[PDB]
Every structure is written in structure tokens, then in C-alpha cells.
Assembly symmetry: C3
Homo-oligomer: 117 residues x 3
């Protein structure tokens, strides 16, 4: 797919997602929420959406990823919503790996009001 920016990395065939980098240094105190920018935009292929999910290295540090749904039509820059849910302060270096992007299939249903049994 078409992407702009260098905040996203090519992956191998055997990996599920693309590593996303932090565009600038970020400090987070316990309980702080900050939207970390990546500087990348992309054109998800028709019929698919992107899921931002955490990496074990940052997660093991007590950092979590919130939200995480990239809609196919989105063209803005991708941002990773991170929170320090640990009890110690953390600094994420610039261009550090903070999350992963996984491309998944779309399923559109019509909503039918009825009675589910």
C-alpha cells in the first residue's frame, strides 16, 4: 500500500504487523495519556482496516495502547494513544518502536431491527 513518511517499517512475511516509531521524544508520568505522533499516513487497501496494537517490549514496561482503529478512509497522520498505567515514569526516545500496525479484513452488515432468540 501507499504510505508517506518513515515512521513505519517494512516487515517480513512471517510477521503480523508493521512497527510504528515515535516521531519525537515523549515523557509520561504514571497515569498520563498522550497521543504519540508517528508522522506516517497511509492508504489502506480497499476492504481492510488497520489495527494498532502493542508490542511486548513496551507493554512489559507498563505502557498500554488505547483506541487503535484505523478506518480505510482515514488519510490523516497515524497517532498512537499511549498511557503509563505503571507506577514509574517513562521516556520514549525519538523514533523508538512503540506499537505495531496489523491489517485486517472488513465486514459490513446491514442492521436489521428484529428479535434475537
Amino acid at each position: 500500500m501507499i504510505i508517506e513518511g518513515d515512521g513505519i517499517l517494512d516487515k517480513r512475511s512471517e510477521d503480523a504487523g508493521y512497527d510504528l516509531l515515535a516521531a519525537k521524544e515523549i515523557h509520561l508520568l504514571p497515569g498520563e495519556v498522550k497521543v504519540i505522533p508517528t508522522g506516517v499516513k497511509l492508504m489502506l487497501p480497499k476492504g481492510y482496516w488497520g489495527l494498532i496494537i502493542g508490542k511486548s517490549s513496551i507493554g512489559s514496561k507498563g505502557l498500554d495502547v488505547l483506541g487503535g482503529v484505523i478506518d480505510e478512509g482515514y488519510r490523516g497522520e497515524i497517532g498512537v494513544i499511549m498511557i503509563n498505567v505503571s507506577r514509574k515514569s517513562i521516556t520514549l526516545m525519538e523514533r523508538q518502536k512503540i506499537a505495531q500496525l496489523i491489517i485486517l479484513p472488513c465486514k459490513h452488515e446491514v442492521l436489521e431491527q428484529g428479535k434475537v432468540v
Copy 2:
């Protein structure tokens, strides 16, 4: 698919999930976990499951979604498990958008005890 209730909204073709609304007003103090009700039930199509995932607007407020797996056979009402992982108190208005439902494909494997190399 068949649904009952008005706590879920039709989406566009370009969106990955359906917005879920809160059935009643909810207050959450830092560190509090509450199962927010939506009032909706649904009949997921055979071969698929539903994933409840967070929205960037509430997530940016320090709210996270836990659990999140709707099994195809479930017919009960859908509930969103939310926690205030931020350091400030939050109130979710009635019928406010709190999460998103995404329909994904099922893959059933048989478990073979063996030796993975």
C-alpha cells in the same frame, strides 16, 4: 444482521465498526472498573465474532476497554467493560459513544498435542 435495541449505530461502508452507546449515565473514579450496559443484543452472522474496541475520543480521556470478545453464540445483552486508568474523574453521559463493534472472521483449529520445533 439482526439486532435488538437502539444502543448500536449503522455505519458507513468505509468505517470498520459500529458505534456503541451507553444506556445510562456512568461516573468513574480513577482506577474504577464498571460494566457499562448498551441495551443491545445481536445475532452475529455464522462464522464471525465481534470485537469491542475503543474509540479515540474516549481513549484520549484515559478510559480503556477490557475483555471485548463477543462469541457468535452469545445472545445476551452487550456490555462494555470500562476502566478509568487516568488520574481524573469522568462522567459518561447517557447514550454517549463509548466503544466500537468490529465483526471479524472465525478460525477453528483442532488441538494436536505434539512437539513444536
Copy 3:
């Protein structure tokens, strides 16, 4: 698929994921992150990855699952990264159900540097 270990349970046709058990007793104080071991390894089918996601029973207790992406090529033992984001202490008994594994499809794209409109 081929698995080794008894920390993972067969599921029904109607369930989305396989329950994962804790290999040993674990205590977690508010705000503590610990990688809970399961003792299971597996050979994900080619073309798929595994997603570790939370269960409503533990999630309703204020426990969250971080990270969660099993790459198809991984052969090591599966570990569940858990954090107590609640305000009370928790003990997870040995062989207790702590998470769920869901198998999802892989989508590999080539990264094309361009200009997204």
C-alpha cells in the same frame, strides 16, 4: 494445529478463542506488570497470527492484557502480559483462566512510498 503443553484448552465451534491458563500462582499489586507464563507453545497455521485478548471475568476485576500479538513464526512459549490497573490487590490461582487466544488472518502488503491524497 500442533501445540505442546496443557495450558491451552479446546474450544467449541461457537467460541472465538481458546482459554489460556496460568502456569503458576501470581500475585499482582495495584499498578504491577508481570508476564504470566502458560507453558504452551504452538505452531500457528501458515497465513495466520494469534491474538491474545482478555476474558470478561478477569477484566471485570480490573486486570488488563498488554501486547498480545503472536507471530506465525514464533515457537517459544506463550506468555500473557498482565497488569493490575485496579486499586485492589489480586491473586491469580495456578491453572486459572487468564486470557483467550484467537486465530486471525495475515495480510502482507508491500510498502510503497508515495503521496496519500
